[PDB]
Amino acid sequence: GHHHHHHMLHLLEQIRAYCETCWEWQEAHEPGMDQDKNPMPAPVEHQICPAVCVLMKLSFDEEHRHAMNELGGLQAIAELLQVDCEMYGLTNDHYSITLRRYAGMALTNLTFGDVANKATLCSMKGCMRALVAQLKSESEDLQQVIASVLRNLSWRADVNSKKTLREVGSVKALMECALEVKKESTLKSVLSALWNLSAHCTENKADICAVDGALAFLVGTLTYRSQTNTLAIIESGGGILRNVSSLIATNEDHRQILRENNCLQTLLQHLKSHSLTIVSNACGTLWNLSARNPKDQEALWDMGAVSMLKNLIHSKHKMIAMGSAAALRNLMANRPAKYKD
């Protein structure tokens, strides 16, 4: 019979009505000292977590996602996230933390494989500012959900969305976040988001390198010791390093940072990895760093890089074949004088 997503409608209607409640408060918020009363709408008193929790679970299925997209679900969930962040700031309140996490999980699912929803969410600038700001939250699980959203927003982004992600300071915020995270799984999401952002433009690459301690940290991630039986951190960190190494190659200071954290020698060890992503990333980084610098050319020569790169030039993987060969040409074309006697 009349069997539609009316429960979903009811759950969206709950969230829109709570959103409405909140915007009445902040419309009425007399700048600064609103009054002695001090009561914002509390999301617990509206039972919002259960509502957003249900929409989050429904968002794993594609058919419910289609229904959600017809009924403006992404706009409502994003609005919910924004307003709570704006009202209560960077709280450790578990009810507020849980709310933002579940909202962010739904936005992650809703932006997955959906270029329109990526653009819509990116066009909601206030929500995007809230997301970025939540990377400074003391909840590392919130950070992790926030980075998951930005990871999907940074993948197959249209040019305006790419422009917005840059303008809201997502790149700097993710890199500064990364330096302070303890939980491995949080770091994965954070570095997954950065790896994506790092391929967009020179400006994003430059901003990653400009963050204090960021290149030293990224070199450290190359020898990360996982507690989750995965190479995600080495792959993502090295992938970020590969994309930004085009700029590091022009910069003697940034090269010197890499040298003192044993980067080139680690990149050579990475050529023997059982992850082909790690080998590929290293071949890309070595390609860049072996151009236009005698110091690192001579250093790679001394570490046996030429013999190591030879072994991969006939690889069946294309970027390993291309990456090792181009780095090999550079070293062959700049043979140090002491290897001609």
């Binding site: 999980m105 992650t108 699912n109 997955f112 959900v145 990871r151 999907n152 993948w155 790896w195 993502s236």
Partner: peptide, 7 residues
């Protein structure tokens, strides 16, 4: 890093 459902 690609894209993904939440995990």
């Amino acid at each position: 890093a690609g894209e993904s459902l939440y995990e």
